[PDB]
Design a protein around this ligand. Structure first.
Ligand SMILES: *[C@@H]1O[C@H](CO)[C@@H](O[C@@H]2O[C@H](CO)[C@@H](O[C@@H]3O[C@H](CO)[C@@H](O)[C@H](O)[C@@H]3O)[C@H](O)[C@H]2NC(C)=O)[C@H](O)[C@H]1NC(C)=O
Ligand SMILES: CCC1(CC)CC(=O)N([C@@H]2CCOc3ccc(C(=O)N[C@H]4CC(C)(C)Oc5ccccc54)cc32)C(=N)N1
Length: 357
């Protein structure tokens, strides 16, 4: 019931990371590792928390094709005397490596003593189709596989000018996509921001009360949730619902010249977050793919939350909605704020942060 305010900040307290939309579909920024600095181009992933860097310890083909980080060239790289192995399995691949500490620079801000995973193996594969160099995880610290301090938390603890919030502006056809640390920019949205409380600090997870495709109620008979996950380009539904969705949302042949008409009669999707209703128009949740219009959706069953979790991804959701991620503390819940994205945005002219009243 207690509101947040958008307050102005000096430009250095909200730093902007340009995100380049690569042909392999990654939105990657720039990250400097160690001294002398080595440059990598990671994705920024609200669906995980570990910091991963691809290293010269991985000699596989998928790793050798990118600019591998070499820890033996870094004066600041440190291993602990007793090492730790890390092995992550997810739907489209696996990542395994060891733990180390390093100094990072993100947006001219320095972070020391940062635990990170050194990729040694990318083989279970998604890595054969992308030029993967790393992940800056932005989930809650509960998802860390190792270390006591997440990258975001550690960055904040060493840079008192930053507020514990960040936001994403996704505009791939513009080359204006931006990851913002410490606040927001009014250049990237219009209307008001509406806040949704985070119900469990693991993923960025909020209550989801219903889903409609046209007039058909696709959700919810049981208590459901939405997860804002920049690490997936697609929106997702659980299996039970995913089949029913594609049954009423078929693909269609399309070109840049006829898709507006092809899709003119497709249904509008609505997500219900309490009194907030978010709608996705056909030209927003359908994407052009190999002479075809296809729904930017995929099936995903999240074992925690009992497969009642629905993911909101970079291309089918954040492209249309500017999203803010606000880190709660103590009795104050973390929150996600959502606003209609401003399509006319160019550069972030001014910057602000959300203050809690
Ligand atoms: C990165 O991690 C290192 C290792 O923990 C940090 O170095 C440590 O920093 C603390 C505080 O600056 C030092 O505390 C000192 O301990 C002596 C006793 O040895 C005490 O009498 C002093 O009053 C002082 O508080 C600690 O010695 C130091 N440890 C080492 C091995 O150098 C470092 O601060 C971390 N860097 C950042 C940016 O957080
Ligand atoms: C980044 C992977 C992890 C953490 C290791 C693990 C993980 O599964 N997810 C989500 C959870 C929900 O289910 C899925 C399902 C699929 C994908 C996927 O294939 N993602 C692609 C996107 C692309 C090609 C742009 O970049 C990369 C870059 C690297 C790896 C994967 C991708 C992601 C998720 C994360 N959010 N993070």
């Amino acid at each position: 019931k207690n509101a947040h305010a958008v307050v102005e900040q000096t430009e250095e307290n909200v730093f902007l990371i340009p995100l380049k939309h690569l042909r392999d579909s990654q939105f990657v920024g720039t990250l400097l590792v160690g001294v002398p600095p080595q440059e990598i181009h990671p994705i920024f992933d609200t669906g995980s928390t570990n910091l991963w860097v691809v290293t010269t310890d991985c000699e596989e083909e998928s790793c050798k094709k990118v600019k591998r980080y070499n820890p033996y060239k870094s004066k600041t790289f440190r291993r602990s005397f007793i090492g730790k192995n890390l092995h992550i399995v997810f739907g489209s691949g696996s990542i395994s490596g060891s733990i180390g500490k390093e100094t990072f620079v993100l947006g001219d801000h320095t972070v020391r003593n940062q635990t990170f995973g050194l990729v040694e193996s990318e083989s279970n594969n998604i890595f054969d189709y992308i030029d993967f160099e790393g992940i800056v995880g932005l989930g809650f610290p509960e998802m860390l596989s190792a270390g006591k301090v997440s990258f975001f938390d550690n960055l904040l603890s060493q840079n008192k000018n930053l507020s514990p919030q960040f936001s994403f502006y996704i505009s791939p056809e513009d080359n204006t996509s931006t990851f913002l640390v410490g606040g927001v920019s009014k250049s990237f949205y219009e209307g008001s921001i509406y806040m949704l409380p985070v119900v469990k600090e693991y993923y960025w997870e909020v209550e989801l009360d219903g889903i409609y495709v046209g007039e058909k109620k696709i959700c919810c008979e049981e208590k459901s949730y939405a997860i804002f996950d920049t690490g997936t380009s697609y929106n997702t539904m659980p299996s039970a619902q995913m089949k029913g969705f594609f049954d009423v949302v078929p693909s269609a042949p399309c070109t840049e010249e006829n898709y507006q008409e092809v899709l003119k009669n497709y249904p509008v999707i609505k997500y219900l977050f309490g009194d907030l209703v978010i709608e996705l128009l056909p030209e927003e949740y359908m994407i052009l793919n190999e002479e075809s219009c296809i729904p930017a959706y995929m099936q995903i069953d999240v074992p925690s939350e009992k497969n009642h979790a629905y993911l909101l991804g970079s291309i089918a959701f954040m492209r249309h909605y500017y999203t803010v991620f606000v880190r709660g503390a103590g009795g104050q819940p973390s929150m996600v704020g959502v606003a209609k994205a401003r399509a006319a945005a160019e550069a972030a002219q001014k910057v602000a942060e959300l203050e809690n009243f």
